[PDB]
Each structure stands twice: as C-alpha cells, then as structure tokens.
Write a protein that binds this ligand. Structure first.
Ligand SMILES: O=c1ccn([C@@H]2O[C@H](COP(=O)(O)OP(=O)(O)O)[C@@H](O)[C@H]2O)c(=O)[nH]1
Ligand SMILES: CC(=O)N[C@@H]1[C@@H](O)[C@H](O)[C@@H](CO)O[C@H]1O
Length: 506
C-alpha cells in the first residue's frame, strides 16, 4: 500500500458487543464516507463464530476487516459457505445415519468408532461453521470453515478430557501456513515452517511489521491488553493515536499526589511520550485528562475531542410512540444498574399503571433482572428484549432511562436523543452531562457515593411521574432533537477530515 491507511486495533467482537466495538463501527462509517483506506484489526482468537459473521453484523465491510490469525494466510475474510457435504469430504466416507438438534448435526458412520458433529450457521440451512471429529468417544480434531477450511484444532485425551495441543491455519489450497503449539490455553510457539515465534507478543510484532507501516499511516489503538508495548514500538514509524473510551482514572483512589488510572489506559498514559495524540469523546474529559497529565506526569500530550458516534439524521417516529413506554439499551452489566431502573419503574407504575419498560442488551445481570420482575409480578409491563438492531427501535418509545454511574460518551444516549427521546439519568460525567439538559430534555438526578437503593428508586420513580404529570413530553422530545443536531454526521466528518489532513502532511 502507498495510500494513507488508518489501522484500528481492538481485542475482539461478539454478537452482543460493547460500545467500544460500536464506536469502531461508527468510525468505519466515517472512513467510508471520507473515502479513506481503513482496517479494523482484531487480535483475539475467535473460533466460536466465523469472525466475518460478527463484523458484517455490526456493519463493517469485509474489506475493512483484519483478523490477526487469518492475516498471515491467503484466505479472505468471508461468510461461511461450506456445506455438510463439503465438510464430510474432509473425513472418511460411509455415513450410516444422522441426528439433528437445532444447529447441532451429528453424522454417524458404520465404523461405530467414529462420528462427526457439524455446527450449522442456520438450523434450517446446510452451511457448516465448524465440525468436530470424534473417535471411540475422544475428540481428535475440530475444523473451522468460511468458503473453505481456514483452521484445524488438534486434541488428545487426558483423564478422558480432550486437551487442545495444536492449532493450524491454512491457505486456500489446503496447505498449512503455520502451527500454534498450545499449552493449557497459552499460545506458546507459532511455527511458520521456515521460522518460529515464541509468545503472542512476538507474533503480534511480526503481524505489525507485515503491515509495512509508512510515515503517512495512522494506527488508532482502541484496546490493547497484552499487546501495548509491541503496538507502541512498531507504530513509531507511522503515527499513533490512542482512543480513550470510558472514564480513565479512579476518583476514589486518587488524591493530590497520586493518581490511579483505569487499567485499560495505565500503559498508554505511562508512555504518553510515544503517542502522537489521544482522542476523547467530550471536552470535559479532554480538560480533566490534560490537567492530570500536567499534575501527575512529565508528559504533555496532544489531546483531541472527537465524539465516538454521530447521528446521520434525526429519526422521527414512523407509526407513533406507545403511550407511557420506557426504554433502556445497554450491556446487562453491574455498572449500568438496570436493577435500580426496574425497581423505579415498579414504583412509578403504582401512579401510572400504563407504564411499560423494555430493556435491550445482553449480559450477566439478566438473572437478577428476571428475579426482580418475577418477585413483583411485573412480567406484563417490564421485559428483556435481548441485544437488537436499534435504529428503528428508539422512536417507538417515549422516554429513555439510564442508571449508569459513568459514561465516557454513551452511544445509546446519542442514539436515544437522535430519535427524540427525553433522557432521565444520574448527574455524572461525562455522557449524561453532555446529553441531558436538566428540565429541558429530561432530568439529571443527583447521585451519591453511598448509593442507597430505596432513595434511588424513589428519585427515578418521582422523576418519571413528574415528566408525565407536568406534561413535559412534547417540549422535552423537541429539546432532545435540538441537542441532537449538535451530534450530526456532517459535523463529525469535518473533525475526522481535519485530523486526517493534519496527520497527512505535517
Ligand atoms: O440491544 C442492544 C443494546 C446496545 N446496542 C449497542 O451497543 C452500543 C453501546 O454503547 P454505549 O456507549 O451505550 O455503552 P457501552 O457498552 O460502551 O458502555 C450502542 O451503540 C448500542 O446501539 C445494540 O446494538 N443493541
Ligand atoms: C461505561 C462506559 O464508560 N462506557 C463507554 C461508553 O460511554 C462509550 O460510549 C464507549 C465508546 O467510546 O466506550 C464505552 O465502553
């Protein structure tokens, strides 16, 4: 490549990803619009799914995607198109019968000692994402497929448990490119046939060098656990930007003489002299971080404010908004405190029996949330919707609720106001203070460090009730759209263009 390329580095991606991954997807949308060459690199081993299925889901174009382990081969990022028949060709013939159970297809043979389990992309299609080969009860090999087999895993029995010892990655023609020798989940040795790498760091270094980075390239680092030093070192011949996503230090641990950074930034902040610029989503975080660099460190890095999201256009309700309908959208994670919202809604429902509350997202808090709902017999008006595509969802509702105690930005807050939702949330930095004008487009609720649950639920309940009882909904929605005009894609393109124009040239 001769053209400027923007390389973006993250660990992983899933069906129900965090805002970090969605922010990357927003950024990809911007780079496409600016007709700029970009790559989004993921460094995690992802085998449970075809990585292309995940990236396409979130909206990356296939040619914007680099997967670390695939990169050294000539197999392109692609959807799974291998069939059951294609799969069975890798294993010996003579099928006796099958068993199907959803996506799990087990193919039995007359050789009673062997069977193949296929894991289908779609229960009602014959596309096979990966397959498992079992001999006399023992798992021996797993193959992984896109348009051909790109990876095999090799297993041997120990105490009757299958132990992974080797992973091999292939080229299109079926020849192996490299083997990873495994030890209890650690990728210890990467054997490239004519050379060898010891440890993932060395492997990632080789990857970085394989990019042939030019001075006019930009490396943007989103997440970096395990690989920071190698990325930092190899990015010096290009330009290096670090995106700060969440709150970046611990207030409770910090005092006049000592600061405790967020673990995901400690490395980057310690070595800020190696970073060309940091990116933050709000000016308040910008100023906070700048001050802390001056107060606690010997660095004075460049820090630019670029929102991680933008709104293409405001979205109007297409068929109207259900009366008294409430929405929240997040990972079901402790730091979002959706349980406080559920209890608040149960309470407000005493005064407004028409209230409903839909909860979008996935996460380990689902068990607690179901328990609270069951305990109050609230199933008919409070529901978990799962992780969904939200673009058409928000404008079907009246008001958005958040009990998150901290947001670097909060993409669902931006998305919510872009669809004309008033917001009710805690008066906490940074996102809530960016997106909520108390009394104009919703309410900011004072937060306390002791976090008394009874007080919290009473406050949210009171505020929800007040919005409806004082007839504030029309005015607040209108004000949300007004705030949202400050977060439109047109503005953001210019911010990126400007930043890109400054890394290109000087
Ligand atoms: O059911 C859901 C819930 C969330 N999201 C997306 O996940 C991202 C969450 O980002 P945010 O900044 O709100 O929270 P984070 O997960 O970063 O704390 C947003 O872009 C949402 O649109 C989604 O697509 N479907
Ligand atoms: C809890 C928290 O701070 N989450 C931040 C979010 O506010 C921000 O929108 C996103 C994308 O930058 O990074 C997140 O993970």
């Amino acid at each position: 490549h001769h053209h400027m390329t923007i390389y973006n580095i993250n660990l992983g991606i899933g069906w129900a990803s965090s805002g970090v991954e969605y922010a990357q997807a927003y950024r990809a949308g911007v780079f496409r619009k600016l007709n700029l060459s970009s790559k989004f690199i993921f460094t995690d081993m992802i085998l449970a799914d075809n990585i292309q299925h995940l990236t396409a889901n979130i909206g990356f174009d296939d040619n914007q995607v680099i997967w670390l382990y695939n990169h050294f081969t000539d197999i392109k990022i692609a959807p799974t198109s291998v069939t059951v028949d294609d799969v069975l060709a890798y294993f010996g013939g003579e099928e006796s019968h099958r068993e199907k159970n959803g996506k799990v297809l087990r193919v039995f043979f007359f050789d009673q000692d062997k069977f193949v389990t296929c894991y289908l992309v779609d229960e009602n299609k014959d596309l096979v994402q990966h397959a498992e080969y079992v001999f006399k009860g023992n798992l021996i090999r797993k193959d992984y497929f896109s348009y051909t087999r790109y990876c095999s895993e090799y297993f041997a029995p120990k105490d009757n448990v299958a132990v992974l010892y080797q992973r091999t990655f292939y080229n299109e023609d079926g020849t192996p490119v490299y083997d990873i020798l495994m030890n209890q989940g650690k990728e210890e040795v990467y054997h490239f046939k004519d050379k060898i790498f010891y440890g993932k760091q060395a492997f990632v270094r080789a990857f970085m060098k394989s990019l042939n980075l030019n001075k006019s390239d930009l490396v943007i680092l989103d997440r970096e656990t395990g690989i920071g030093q190698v990325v930092f070192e190899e990015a010096q011949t290009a330009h290096l930007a670090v995106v700060v996503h969440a709150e970046h230090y611990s207030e409770n641990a910090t005092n006049e003489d000592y600061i405790l950074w967020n673990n995901y930034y400690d490395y980057q902040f310690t070595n800020a002299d190696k970073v060309d610029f940091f990116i933050v989503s709000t000016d308040r975080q910008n100023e906070v971080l700048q001050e802390q660099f001056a107060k606690y460190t010997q660095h004075q890095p460049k820090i630019v404010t670029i929102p991680v999201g933008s709104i293409d256009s405001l979205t109007d309700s297409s068929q109207g908004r259900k009366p008294f309908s409430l929405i929240t959208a997040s990972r079901l994670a402790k730091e979002k405190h959706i349980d406080w919202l559920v209890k608040a809604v149960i309470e407000a429902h005493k005064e407004l029996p028409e209230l409903t509350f839909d909860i979008y997202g996935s996460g380990g808090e689902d068990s607690l949330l179901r328990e609270i709902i069951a305990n109050h017999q609230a199933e008919d008006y409070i529901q978990l919707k799962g992780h969904a595509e939200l673009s058409q969802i928000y404008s079907q509702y009246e008001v958005y609720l958040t009990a998150s105690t901290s947001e670097g930005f909060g993409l669902t807050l931006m998305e919510a106001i872009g669809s004309g939702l008033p917001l009710i949330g805690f008066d906490v930095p940074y996102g809530n203070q960016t997106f909520i004008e108390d009394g104009q487009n919703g309410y900011l609720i004072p937060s306390s460090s002791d976090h008394v649950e009874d007080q919290i639920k009473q406050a949210y309940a009171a505020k929800i009730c007040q919005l409806y009882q004082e007839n504030r909904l029309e005015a607040m929605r209108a004000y949300s759209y007004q705030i949202a005009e400050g977060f439109l894609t047109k503005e953001i393109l210019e911010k990126w263009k400007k930043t890109v124009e400054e890394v290109l040239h000087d």
